[PDB]
């Protein structure tokens with residue numbers, strides 16, 4: 216037992232962890248990017264998966280848990296309301312990870328990309344991720360796709376040890 220954070224630049228649908236967090240689209244839809252990859256790999260986990268912005272809902276695919284976390288779309292939310300809902304989504308992820316009793320979890324950065332409102336939200340989203348997941352016992356593996364983001368996430372991980 217020595218919980219860590221790691222970052223990998225690859226498709227989260229190929230993760231090596233005991234459960235996955237989906238950067239879920241609202242309304243339980245297949246979405247794009249990460250959510251679409253999750254839909255292609257674990258389509259059964261989208262049965263009644265819809266959950267409001269700021270929340271998370273776990274649906275099993277077989278016995279593999281998919282934690283659907285709906286971050287805010289900053290094109291629709293103000294900066295202050297969106298920040299609150301982004302923090303809350305990660306808090307509900309940490310609660311689901313705890314309830315599931317998993318030893319590890321694969322997580323993407325919520326409210327980035329098409330939900331970012333055209334702004335770079337790495338630091339904002341990653342810091343809410345740390346605040347929530349620091350409360351758990353699980354190994355956390357953060358998944359990104361951009362090479363400069365991998366570098367920055369790795370630097371943030373390094374300066375917490």
Ligand SMILES: [Cl-]
Pocket residue numbers: 359360361364
């Ligand atoms: Cl990325």
